[PDB]
Structure formats: structure tokens, C-alpha cells
């Protein structure tokens, strides 16, 4: 049984690998080298948001591209007004070890999660005028690393117990649980259609899941270390991964293989956050070197370095209209970066 | 600014004031992380007390200790959060030599962690009485698992304050030096490991954790004034 089974696995993997080789008929490089390069993307610190007293661990732009929510080990979950650097809300978290935060598409709710293995949903728009926790989603046997609302009542959370789960806020029970990862899941990225969602795990692999089907569809390998952050191409047919091996990788949902590796000998630290631009031509990517290096998605050429921060760029994010980039770091400063002509 | 943006700015100022007050209130406590094996008896260290937070006060200084139970077997990818802790209280069972090598491996992994390159470690050798009884009986030999013990002799000019036979002192200092070798093989002086000995019944563990956070904080103060 174990012999024949591993044998089956081996020959199946052989098929997958060889099938992938077949597809490879060219490279993104040999198909993109004839296009004009982006040039040099220079970004200034257009706004600095301060008030946190500890390392910022996550951020998430609202759907209006104006409000963002930042979570830090201070124990607070602030709702910034990025246009005027005003703190709309300051939610005191039950546990001061938050590792992720999320803003619902509706703008009505926010979520936080950390080492308490509980996702707390806060009702920002309440009649009493105070943001109070509306539901605590317990049932995870590991630290929470990422959470994303589906529309307003389903939230997909990835924990350190090698499982990702789809929740029902009204009932508080896991509608569907996703298994298959052999290591801690560090990030997830919902597709624009909110029908598929990927997850980057510490097993140096990424899996494409289906929220309705409840099981994985594709798996992707090629990273030499843990995947700290993952994103999604705006078209929904590709995604990018940020690993600890200092190389970003762009995968595809159809060719089922990596496309281009964003590497440089100057940088040896791992990528902490990966965020795509509105058009998908620019690949923002934070690094542990305190610098967010902007990568050309179709060229793997460093267009620019957002060099402002003083400790690891911990979270990233691009507005829904693509008008700004917000990078949060362990120095408690959240800086909004915008490009000027 | 309009009349509704001036009031919004006033609300933001009040939020800032509350945040600063909360930060000032929370800055008076020292944060610690307790790490160790299942048989290490980690919980029993400070005695009279997903994260089992333990708060004890000594010399009018409030200590916060975060025992991260459950989670998964690995201690990585969650230890990034504990980058600002003053010290790490590593507890290891020194009486079970079968799992002693894996304890050395765990300590090596903790010491060489990239995010703990500046966080000191307060190491506790738990189960002193069991170790003494085991080496007194002689049924289990330390040299059986560690061949270098037989050639190793007692450290010259040591400090064996309690009145035990040379075998107990030799074994205790052998384990202590085994941990210290990994402690000093790296860190380049940015952080140091303080080894102690715990009998699983002593109530002075809090004092040792304090007297040692006064040399972790003193070293940090020396580094701010560039006097080190």
C-alpha cells in the first residue's frame, strides 16, 4: 500500500510535470522583450500616518480607496482616513497579538486575527456610535495569518494549522474547510470574481481553491522557501507569490506553471508583502531590507525602490482605483506612496 | 477645513490622546516569552503567578510572560511577533538525556533565528533534583549519549555552592557548558544567554528572571548612549 501508493504519486507527478513541460512553448521574457519598458517609477511619501505604538502587521484599503485599516501589536486596529490622515476609529483588540486585518467590501465591517486563533468581526457602523465586536469565529487550531471577506457575511481565513476555512458570520460555523497544505498558510488572495482563492503556505507551494466546490483545483511549486505573502493578477487568470528565498514568482491559472522570477543578487532578504498595480504592469513588493522594491511584472526589471521606511515593510496595498500605495512597517509608520509626474 | 472636518480633526486628536495614554500605561510592563519542551515543566518556573499569559510582579516591576501553547510543533513564523520581548525564558529538562540533544537543537534554532538576533535568552536547567538523583544512582551514564563527557573534566575554579559530590557538579556544569557553547558560537555579543538551575520547587525563579532583566535592560541602555 504505501509503496504502490507513493509509486502512483510518483507517476502522477511525472504526468503533471511533463504535461507542464509540453505547455512551455515559450517564456514571458521571449514574448515581452519587444515591448517598451516602464522606465523609472519614482514614488514620494505623499502622506505619513502615525499613531501606532508598535510594529504594524497588516493593512487593507477600503473599497472607496480612502479608508484603510491597520493592525499592530499595540493592541489597536485603527481605521485611517488616508486623504486627511484622520483616525476615524480606534478599536481596542481583545488580544494584542494581531497578525492580519481586513476591510469588508461593504465598509460596514472589519476583521482581525492573530495568535488567539480567533477571527473577530467588528461592526463599524452601529447605532450606539461605538464599534463593537459582532462575531468571534473560533474553530482554528493555529494562529491566523490572513482573512478576507467574500461579500458581507462569508470570510475566508487561513490559519497556521495548514488549513483554510470559509466562515459564516451569522452562524459562526465553518461552512467549508480546505485541506492539503503540509505547512503553515501565511497568506491568501481572493480572486476579483470572489469564486476562487489562492493560499501561500510554508511548504514552498501555493494552492488554488474553489469556495463553492470546497476542494483545491491546482497546486504550484517552484519556491525554495516559505511563501510569506501572495497576491492576485487583476485579470484573475494569474497570481504572484512572495517567498523568503528573496525571489518573487508569477504563476498562471491556465498554463499551470511559473512565468517569470523576479530576482536580484543585491537583495537577499525575503519578500514580506506582494501587491499588484491596477493595470498589472507594476508588481509592488515589500522586503525585509526596509525597502519596497517595485518590480516590472512583464520585464523583471526594478523600475523603482520606495525607500522610505526604517524597519521591515510588513504590509502592502494598492487602492481600488490604483491611485496610491500604502506600505506599513514595524516602525509603526504607515506611509501612502503616490506617483507624481 | 470645513466645520465637519474641524470636528473630525478634534475626534482624531482625542483618539491620539487615548492611544498615547494607553501606550504610556502599557509601557510600564516588561514582556517575556516562555519556550520549552513538553517534559520541560515550563509552567512551574515562576511558580506563584491560545497564549497563556502569566503576570507576576517583583520589586514593583510588572512582568508579562506569554506561554504560546498549542499552535503547532514548529516555533517559527509566529516568533516574529515576539521580536520586542525583553528576554526569552527557555526551559529545558536536564534530567532526561534522551531528549537533551533535541533540546540542544531547539536552543540552536532559537539562538540563530534572524528575528531573535537581538533578544537575549534566560535559560533554565529544570529538574535539578532528578538530575542529581539520576547521576547518584549511576544506572544511566551521560557518556552513553554524549561521548565527549568522558574526556571532559570539571571546570577549574568553578562555583559549586551547594554541598554535593563532584559527580553532580560535573554533570551540571557539563550541561551548562553544552548550552553555553551554542550560546556563544554566534550573536557577536548583540545578545547573551544566562544559564541557571531550577529544582522545580524553588520560589526564587522570579528573582533570577528580574536580576537578569536588569542586565538586559542595562545593556540596552548602554547601547542607546553609544557607550557600547
Amino acid at each position, epitope marked *: 500500500e504505501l509503496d504502490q501508493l507513493r509509486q502512483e504519486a510518483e507517476q502522477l507527478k511525472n504526468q503533471i510535470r511533463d504535461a507542464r513541460k509540453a505547455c512551455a512553448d515559450a517564456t514571458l521574457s521571449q514574448i515581452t522583450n519587444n515591448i517598451d519598458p516602464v522606465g523609472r517609477i519614482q514614488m514620494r511619501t505623499r502622506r505619513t500616518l502615525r499613531g501606532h505604538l508598535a510594529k504594524i502587521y497588516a493593512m487593507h484599503w477600503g473599497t472607496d480607496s480612502r479608508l484603510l485599516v491597520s493592525a499592530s501589536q499595540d493592541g489597536k486596529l485603527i481605521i485611517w482616513d488616508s486623504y486627511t490622515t484622520n483616525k476615524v476609529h480606534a478599536i481596542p483588540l481583545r488580544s494584542s497579538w494581531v497578525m492580519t486585518c481586513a476591510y469588508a467590501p461593504s465598509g460596514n465591517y472589519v476583521a482581525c486575527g492573530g495568535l488567539d486563533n480567533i477571527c473577530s468581526i467588528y461592526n463599524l457602523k452601529t447605532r450606539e456610535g461605538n464599534v463593537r465586536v459582532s462575531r468571534e469565529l473560533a474553530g482554528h487550531t493555529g494562529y491566523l495569518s490572513c482573512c478576507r471577506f467574500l461579500d458581507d457575511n462569508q470570510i475566508v481565513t487561513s490559519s497556521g494549522d495548514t488549513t483554510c476555512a470559509l466562515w459564516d458570520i451569522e452562524t459562526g460555523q465553518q461552512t467549508t474547510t480546505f485541506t492539503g497544505h503540509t505547512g503553515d498558510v501565511m497568506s491568501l488572495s481572493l480572486a476579483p470574481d470572489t469564486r476562487l482563492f489562492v493560499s501561500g503556505a510554508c511548504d514552498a507551494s501555493a494552492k488554488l481553491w474553489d469556495v463553492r466546490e470546497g476542494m483545491c483545483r491546482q497546486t504550484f511549486t517552484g519556491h525554495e522557501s516559505d511563501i510569506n505573502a501572495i497576491c492576485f493578477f487583476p485579470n484573475g487568470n494569474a497570481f504572484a507569490t512572495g517567498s523568503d528565498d528573496a525571489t518573487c514568482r508569477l504563476f498562471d491559472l491556465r498554463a499551470d506553471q511559473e512565468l517569470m522570477t523576479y530576482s536580484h543578487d543585491n537583495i537577499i532578504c525575503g519578500i514580506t508583502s506582494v501587491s499588484f498595480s491596477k493595470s498589472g504592469r507594476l508588481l509592488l513588493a515589500g522586503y525585509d531590507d526596509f525597502n519596497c522594491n517595485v518590480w516590472d511584472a512583464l520585464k523583471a526589471d526594478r523600475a523603482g525602490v520606495l525607500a522610505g521606511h526604517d524597519n521591515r515593510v510588513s504590509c502592502l496595498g494598492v487602492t481600488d482605483d490604483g491611485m496610491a500605495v500604502a506600505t506599513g512597517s514595524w516602525d509603526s509608520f504607515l506611509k501612502i506612496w503616490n506617483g507624481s509626474s | 477645513v*470645513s466645520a*465637519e472636518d*474641524k470636528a473630525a480633526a478634534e475626534r482624531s486628536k482625542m483618539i491620539d490622546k487615548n492611544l498615547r495614554e494607553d501606550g504610556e500605561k502599557a509601557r510600564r510592563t516588561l514582556r517575556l516569552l516562555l519556550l520549552g519542551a513538553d517534559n520541560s515543566g515550563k509552567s512551574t518556573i515562576v511558580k506563584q503567578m491560545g497564549i497563556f499569559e502569566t503576570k507576576f510582579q517583583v520589586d514593583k516591576v510588572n512582568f508579562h510572560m506569554f506561554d504560546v501553547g498549542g499552535q503547532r510543533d514548529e516555533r517559527r513564523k509566529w516568533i516574529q511577533c515576539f521580536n520586542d520581548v525583553t528576554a526569552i525564558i527557555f526551559v529545558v529538562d536536564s534530567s532526561d538525556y534522551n531528549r537533551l540533544q533535541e533540546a540542544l537543537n531547539d536552543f540552536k534554532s532559537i539562538w540563530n533565528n534572524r528575528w531573535l538576533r537581538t533578544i537575549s535568552v534566560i535559560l533554565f536547567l529544570n529538574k535539578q533534583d532528578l538530575l542529581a538523583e539520576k547521576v547518584l544512582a549511576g544506572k544511566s551514564k551521560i557518556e552513553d549519549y554524549f561521548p565527549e563527557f568522558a574526556r571532559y573534566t570539571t571546570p577549574e575554579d568553578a562555583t559549586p555552592e551547594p554541598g554535593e559530590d563532584p559527580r553532580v557538579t560535573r554533570a551540571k556544569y557539563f550541561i551548562r557548558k553544552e548550552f553555553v557553547d551554542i550560546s556563544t558560537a554566534s550573536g557577536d555579543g548583540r545578545h547573551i544567554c544566562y544559564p541557571h538551575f531550577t529544582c522545580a520547587v524553588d520560589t526564587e525563579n522570579a528573582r533570577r528572571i528580574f536580576n537578569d532583566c536588569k542586565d538586559i535592560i542595562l545593556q540596552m541602555n548602554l547601547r542607546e548612549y553609544n557607550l557600547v
Partner: single-chain antibody
Amino acid sequence: VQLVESGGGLVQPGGSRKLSCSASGFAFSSFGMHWVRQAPEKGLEWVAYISSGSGTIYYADTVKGRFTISRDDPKNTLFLQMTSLRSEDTAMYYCVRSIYYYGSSPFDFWGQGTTLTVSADIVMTQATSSVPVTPGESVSISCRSSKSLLHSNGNTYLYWFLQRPGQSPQLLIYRMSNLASGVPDRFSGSGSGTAFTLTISRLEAEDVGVYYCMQHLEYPLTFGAGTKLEL
């Protein structure tokens, strides 16, 4: 969410009266509170306002000095000390809460009100005061301001209120575009920086009342003359 105001009887001219507004059901300390009067058989006008934390206090030019405001956070009570009352001061004083952040709904809840009987401002004009209309059709309520309420931030600060007969004013639309919570989708608002209109698609029996305009670009807050909707 409930505001009860007590302490209004009859006061001789030139006397002193203390008003109390009891708050219970929401975070009182986080809400800025206003005092709004309403003379009998007349419109309503702003009187005083104290921000959250008692930071900034603004009084209308006709009540400055004579009236002093004071809130009490520990037991959620709003006070309005009255000195040297005049014969024109007899009005029903309303207790209104207002929270100010990005996307909030100021002047959302109004108190029951207490009756008192004494023995450079943007004037909002509502030329039409009585529109006899039947349920089922659509009625448009117009407003106009001397100063363009449109601000550089992109928000036109004009609010609307509904005063049912023998009731308290209820917020319908804030910032001229956003519908208040609980208001039916039948109400709609539009206009420009100077011209403002209020439109109702389908009108039911509960829409009978007086509609008042509102301005929030500048501290002196001014209401409209009102537009009664007779059945």
C-alpha cells in the same frame, strides 16, 4: 438611543433656567451635542453646540453670553444654563446628537423636547411653505443658500429634516446625497452647490409634516423656513 429633556416650565423675564438633557443608549462621550429651539408657530433655529470632550463651544450670535452650555460625561447629561431670559426666548428646546468622522451622520437623533414659556449668516430660503399634495404622486421640496455650500473637499454640507405633527424632527438626508439610516429609499436628494432640491418618489400617509433645510459649511448653523406638506 433615547434623549429625554426635562426642566422647562414658566420663567419670569430676566430670570434663570437650567435645562437638562438625559442621554441613555449610546456612547455619550463620543457624540457632539447641539441645542435647537423652536418658537411656537414658527421655525427652528440653532442655539448652542459643545463638541466631544468639551473642546470647542459655539453659540449663536443672539444667545451668546446669556446662554452657557455644559456637558457631563460621567452620567451622560447635557446642560443648558439660561441667564437673563427674554420674551422671545419661549421655545421648545431640542437635544440633538451629532458624531463627526468621515462618513458619519450628524444630527441623526433628536430629543423629545421641553416647552419653555416666558411671561454674515447663510440664510436658507424656502419660498414655498405649504404644498397640498395627495399620496401616490411625487412632491419636490426646494432649497437655496446665499453662499455655495459646496466645499473644496467635495462635500456639499446640506441636511434635511422631517417634523411630523406633534413630534420631533427626524433626519432624512445628510450631505445632500446620503440617505439616513432607517429612512425609506423613497426619499432622494440632489442639486448643486447653491440650488438644492428634495424629491420623494411615492408618498404615503406618514410623509405629512414640515421639511426644514440645513447648512453646515460654517459655525452659525441656519435652518430653513420650512415647507409644510398638507394631506
